Design an enzyme around this catalytic site. Structure first.
Site, short mmCIF file in Angstrom:
data_model
loop_
_atom_site.label_atom_id
_atom_site.label_comp_id
_atom_site.label_asym_id
_atom_site.label_seq_id
_atom_site.Cartn_x
_atom_site.Cartn_y
_atom_site.Cartn_z
N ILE A 99 0.86 -1.20 0.00
CA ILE A 99 0.00 0.00 0.00
C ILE A 99 0.88 1.23 0.00
O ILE A 99 0.63 2.19 -0.71
CB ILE A 99 -0.87 0.16 1.28
CG1 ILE A 99 -1.95 -0.93 1.42
CG2 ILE A 99 -1.52 1.54 1.24
CD1 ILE A 99 -2.75 -0.91 2.71
N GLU A 125 3.78 3.30 3.01
CA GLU A 125 4.71 3.35 4.14
C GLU A 125 4.19 4.24 5.26
O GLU A 125 3.03 4.66 5.27
CB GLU A 125 6.10 3.81 3.65
CG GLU A 125 6.70 2.87 2.62
CD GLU A 125 8.04 3.34 2.11
OE1 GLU A 125 8.53 4.37 2.62
OE2 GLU A 125 8.59 2.68 1.21
N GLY A 126 5.06 4.51 6.23
CA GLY A 126 4.68 5.18 7.45
C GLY A 126 5.84 5.25 8.42
O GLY A 126 6.95 4.75 8.17
N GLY A 166 6.51 1.50 9.64
CA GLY A 166 7.19 0.70 8.63
C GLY A 166 6.42 0.64 7.31
O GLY A 166 5.60 1.53 7.01
N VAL A 174 3.59 -0.82 4.75
CA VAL A 174 2.19 -1.26 4.85
C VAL A 174 1.80 -2.06 3.61
O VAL A 174 2.04 -1.64 2.44
CB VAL A 174 1.21 -0.09 5.08
CG1 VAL A 174 -0.19 -0.63 5.30
CG2 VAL A 174 1.63 0.70 6.30
N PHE A 229 -8.74 -3.42 7.15
CA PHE A 229 -8.34 -2.73 5.90
C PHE A 229 -9.37 -1.75 5.30
O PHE A 229 -10.56 -2.04 5.18
CB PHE A 229 -7.94 -3.79 4.84
CG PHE A 229 -7.64 -3.19 3.51
CD1 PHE A 229 -8.68 -3.02 2.57
CD2 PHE A 229 -6.36 -2.79 3.19
CE1 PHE A 229 -8.43 -2.48 1.34
CE2 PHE A 229 -6.11 -2.21 1.97
CZ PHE A 229 -7.16 -2.02 1.04
N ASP A 246 -7.32 6.83 2.03
CA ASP A 246 -7.06 7.72 3.15
C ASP A 246 -7.43 9.16 2.75
O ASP A 246 -7.51 9.46 1.56
CB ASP A 246 -5.62 7.64 3.61
CG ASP A 246 -4.61 8.12 2.57
OD1 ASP A 246 -4.46 9.35 2.34
OD2 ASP A 246 -3.92 7.27 2.00
N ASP A 255 -0.22 11.77 16.86
CA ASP A 255 0.35 11.88 15.54
C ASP A 255 -0.68 11.97 14.39
O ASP A 255 -0.43 11.48 13.30
CB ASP A 255 1.26 10.70 15.26
CG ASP A 255 2.10 10.97 14.06
OD1 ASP A 255 2.32 12.18 13.79
OD2 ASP A 255 2.47 10.01 13.35
N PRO A 286 -3.62 13.65 7.79
CA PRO A 286 -4.59 13.12 6.83
C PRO A 286 -4.33 11.70 6.35
O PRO A 286 -5.29 11.00 6.07
CB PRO A 286 -4.52 14.09 5.67
CG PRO A 286 -4.06 15.40 6.29
CD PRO A 286 -3.15 15.00 7.41
N1 RJI Z 1 -5.33 0.04 8.18
C1 RJI Z 1 -4.35 0.94 7.87
O1 RJI Z 1 -3.61 1.52 8.73
C2 RJI Z 1 -4.13 1.06 6.45
C3 RJI Z 1 -5.24 0.82 5.56
O2 RJI Z 1 -6.12 -0.02 5.78
N2 RJI Z 1 -5.18 1.29 4.28
C4 RJI Z 1 -4.26 2.26 3.88
O3 RJI Z 1 -4.32 2.66 2.70
N3 RJI Z 1 -3.28 2.64 4.73
C5 RJI Z 1 -2.31 3.54 4.30
C6 RJI Z 1 -2.64 4.91 4.32
C7 RJI Z 1 -1.72 5.88 3.93
C8 RJI Z 1 -0.45 5.49 3.47
C9 RJI Z 1 -0.10 4.13 3.43
C10 RJI Z 1 -1.02 3.15 3.84
C11 RJI Z 1 -3.24 2.16 6.01
O4 RJI Z 1 -2.28 2.49 6.75
#
Ligand code: RJI
Length: 273
Positions: free
Chosen positions: A10, A12-13, A16, A18, A69, A73, A114, A117
């Protein structure tokens, strides 16, 4: 991990990478977060913090965090809505929902610390949910409350109301309110907007660890200038979320009774998934 098959990265963050993953035992699709004892204790308590506006932590595989899931976002949505802007009724529904989630977590003495958006996840049903809730304590300045930037060690649930203020303003204006590159630049962007704080508006500010008497002194700007063309109720709410003084700052539970929410509804957004 063996129960799951990674479907797609998907993104990152701070914690780590995702992934979208499929539970092979049950076919459920989940978000799998690969992280870089008091931590796992803390993270684990988060499993019991269930509320419809908090993204569910399903299990903790000591680290991978397996979360409920969601497809989109709020940052992706705002970026897509940048030409046109999110309609007010939807902004209001989202704000209301996020205030509900915050009021819940805050009632259990749990803070996000933290909010941004990219952490606010949305579905086609009109829901919005708080992701990564609690992970900070268990182990991007743009949404940081001024008490934290000034070095307060014992910040409170107020910090999340500030962050949510900043997001609310961003949904309305289609621009980040305080897009800082440094802590000082973050703080000066804030001061240039709301004016440089002092004991008048923030009792005790001058005792904060990183407060400097030599801060440039800027005059406050009117909120009608900061979030045009939000109406009076919205501006009034926003000003209370963005009070310098953490004790003056409206609580999530107080915010829910504000007259801006008198006609809150639950619209459905226009998602391309
Ligand atoms: N459950 C979550 O934290 C994820 C989710 O379900 N879907 C999603 O797109 N993200 C995500 C959101 C922003 C950036 C990278 C990944 C989540 O972190």
């Amino acid at each position: 991990m063996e129960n799951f098959q990674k479907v797609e990265k998907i993104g990152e963050g701070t914690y780590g990478v995702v992934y979208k993953a499929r539970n092979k035992l049950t076919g459920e699709v989940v978000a799998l977060k690969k992280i870089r004892s008091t931590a796992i204790r803390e993270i684990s308590l988060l499993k019991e913090l269930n509320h419809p506006n908090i993204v569910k932590l399903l299990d903790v595989i000591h680290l991978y965090l397996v979360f409920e899931f969601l497809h989109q976002d709020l940052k992706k949505f705002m970026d897509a809505s940048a030409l046109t802007g999110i309609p007010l009724p939807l902004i209001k529904s989202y704000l209301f929902q996020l205030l509900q989630g915050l009021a819940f977590c805050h009632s259990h003495r749990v803070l996000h610390r933290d909010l941004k958006p990219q952490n606010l996840l949305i579905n086609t049903e009109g829901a919005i949910k708080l992701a990564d809730f609690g992970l900070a304590r268990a182990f991007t300045l743009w949404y940081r409350a001024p008490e934290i930037l000034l070095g307060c060690k014992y910040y409170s649930t107020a910090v999340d109301i500030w962050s949510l203020g900043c997001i609310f303003a961003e949904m309305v204006t289609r621009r980040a309110l305080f897009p800082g590159d440094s802590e000082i630049d973050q703080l000066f962007r804030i001061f240039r907007t709301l004016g440089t704080p002092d004991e008048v508006v923030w009792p005790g500010v001058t005792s904060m660890p990183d407060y400097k008497p030599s801060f440039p002194k800027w005059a406050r700007q009117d909120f009608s200038k900061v979030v045009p063309p939000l109406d009076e109720d919205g501006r009034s709410l926003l000003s209370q979320m963005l009070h310098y003084d953490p004790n003056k700052r409206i609580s999530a539970k107080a915010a829910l009774a504000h007259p801006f929410f008198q006609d809150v509804t639950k619209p459905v957004p226009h998602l391309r998934l």
